[PDB]
Amino acid sequence: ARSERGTIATYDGVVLARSVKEEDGTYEREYPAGDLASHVVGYSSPQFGNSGIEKAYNDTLKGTAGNDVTLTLNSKIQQAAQDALAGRKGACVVMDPDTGAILAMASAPTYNAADFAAVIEQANANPDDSTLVDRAAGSLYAPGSTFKIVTLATALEDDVAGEDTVFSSPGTMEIGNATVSNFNKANYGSLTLAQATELSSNTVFGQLGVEMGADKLVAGAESFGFNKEIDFPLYTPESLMPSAEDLQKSPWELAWAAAGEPVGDTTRPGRESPAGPQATVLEMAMVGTAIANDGVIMQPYLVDSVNNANGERSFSASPTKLMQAVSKTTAGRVRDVLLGVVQNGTGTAAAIPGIDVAGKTGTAEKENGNDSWFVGMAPAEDPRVVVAIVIEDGEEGVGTAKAQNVLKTALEVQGLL
Ligand SMILES: [Mg+2]
């Protein structure tokens, strides 16, 4: 109450939170950037406590004045991510695949950071109001066909199949005594594995899952970070995969997991492992960074530096490897297939004039619609940016269309456009 709490600002210097000395010599917290990165910045209140960065870095911010925290976020990329989600429910994460730095992290619906108290009040009055939910880091989603990046990468790494391997792609087929179906039950005839990735065929990926088997599929997902607790300053639930033991018992569950749908029956007493895959948007961005960065996932980070009131520097982020998902050769082969998705497949809306874009579209099944996903990277040959976006209950392909705008803004900011 008595001393100046430190500021929180973006990497390009937009102040998200600061303390100003009042009339009576007291200090009050100000949030002068409207709804820019609201969920990330969080709030600090003697009534409501803390959340976001205000919570995670409370000790350094509190402090003699407290220390100033500089985030990795770029305000223009952050705004583009928020604009992509405007009027929708969902989330968007933009990362630098070479460092793990988070350039944008947005959730929708959102709110003005300054108005956190009123928003908390509304949440209490209406348990259905989900504005305060951190969807980018804090929520698990079914990734749907975006997860095929993991299945494909695993199949190539383990030599289960190659890009040229041919699979039947019927509209529906029985696997493990129930049905796996292509989107809209489309019959594509025989497809190479590359073509099946371009068209996003569930029946091909289901068969590929059964062929590789539960042990390999689960190990492959774990190589990309599933079932690992990943350290992060904001609450991030562990992304989940079933045990190999559970998937072994149901070829149908295995086939759907390979296609990104978590169909494991968790209503069944006695089930030992979770349904999966279930992932955060951050995790799906990390999957993208593995493909972009020669197979290596860098540790995601949000704080670039901390500086004292003196101006001196007490913390500087050091980009660091988290895990090697696949080999450099495998990553490159997958990246080439994902370029095909955008050039010739379901991802054409992600194309950007003058820069090659590679990525994977996703549809995740819901009762009366779908969640719409895109994970992609640009420039395709040596990416400088990765974007993951989910639009809940979205029109077909909307995730890809919105990702285009976010990627374009990132490339403009970086000078490539
Ligand atoms: Mg074969």
Encode 19-73 in three state secondary structure. EEECCCCCEEEECCCCCCCHHHHCCEECCCEECHHHHHCHHHHHCCCCCEEEECC
Say how far apart CA 85 and CA 402 lie, in whole Å: 8
CB 214 within 8 Å of CB 244: yes
Cβ atoms of residues 126 and 174 within 8 Å: no
- Extents of the domains making up the chain: 1-23+26-57+64-71+110-125+304-317, 72-109+126-303+318-417
Which fold does the domain 72-109+126-303+318-417 belong to in CATH? Beta-lactamase (3.40.710)
CA of 60 to the centre of ligand 1 (A): 56
211 assigned ligand-binding residue: yes
Which residue's structure tokens are 């939910």? 133
State the sign of the Cα–Cα–Cα–Cα dihedral 145, 194, 97, 327.
positive
CA atoms in the 13 A half-sphere facing the CB of 416: 19
Distance 209 CA to ligand 1 centre (A): 11
Homologous superfamily of the 1-23+26-57+64-71+110-125+304-317 domain (CATH): Penicillin-binding protein 2a (Domain 2) (3.90.1310.10)
Helix, strand or coil, per DSSP, at residue 121: helix
Give 357's Cβ-side CA count (13 Å radius).
33
Q: Please give the Cα distance from 204 to 124 (Å, whole number).
A: 46
Rounded Cα gap, residues 218 and 222, in angstroms? 6
**Collapsed DSSP state (helix, strand, coil) of residue 342:** helix
Distance CA 95, CA 106 (A): 12
What whole-number distance in Å separates Cα of residue 312 and Cα of residue 289? 32
What is the rounded distance in angstroms from the CA atom of residue 222 to the CA atom of residue 309?
43
3-state SS class at 417: coil
Angle of helix 202-223 relative to helix 148-157, nearest 10 degrees, comes to: 70
Ligand 1 centroid to Cα of residue 298, in Å, is 33
User: Could you give the CA distance from residue 336 to residue 293 in angstroms, rounded to a whole number?
Assistant: 13
379 upstream amide cis, omega within 30 of 0: yes
How does strand 8-9 pair with strand 68-71?
Answer: parallel
Instruction: Find the 194 Cα to ligand 1 centroid distance in Å.
Output: 14
CA of 222 to the centre of ligand 1 (A): 23
Burial (0-12, 13-18, 19+ Cβ within 10 Å), 212:
buried
Both tokens of 14, joined, read 């937009």
Amino acid, res. 343: Q
Which residue's entry shows tokens 């497949």? 345
CA of 161 to the centre of ligand 1 (A): 6
State the Cα–Cα distance between residues 233 and 84, nearest whole angstrom.
24
Name the strand (E) or helix (H) holding 118. helix 116-125
How many C-beta neighbours within 10 Å does residue 269 have?
A: 4
**Rounded Cα–Cα distance for residues 234 and 137 (Å):** 7
Quickly list H helices, 3-115: 38-41, 52-56, 58-62, 75-85
Q: Is 337 helix (H, G, I), strand (E, B) or coil?
A: helix
> Quick one: which of 403, 407, 409, 390 has its CA closest to 88?
390
Bridge-based pairing of strands 296-298 and 49-50 is unpaired
Contact of 200 with 177, CB cutoff 8 Å: no
Distance separating alpha carbons of residues 305 and 345, to the nearest angstrom: 41
Distance CA 300, CA 78 (A): 16
Closest CA to 256 of 338, 184, 174: 174
**Please, are residues 113 and 38 in contact by the beta-carbon 8 Å criterion?**
yes
Helix (H) or strand (E) holding 122: helix 116-125
Residue 165 CA, ligand 1 centroid: distance in Å: 7
Distance in angstroms (rounded) separating the CA atoms of residues 113 and 73? 16
- Method by which the model was determined: X-ray
Tell me how far apart the alpha carbons of residues 138 and 136 are, in angstroms, rounded to a whole number: 6
Compute, in angstroms, the gap from residue 351 CA to the centroid of ligand 1: 32
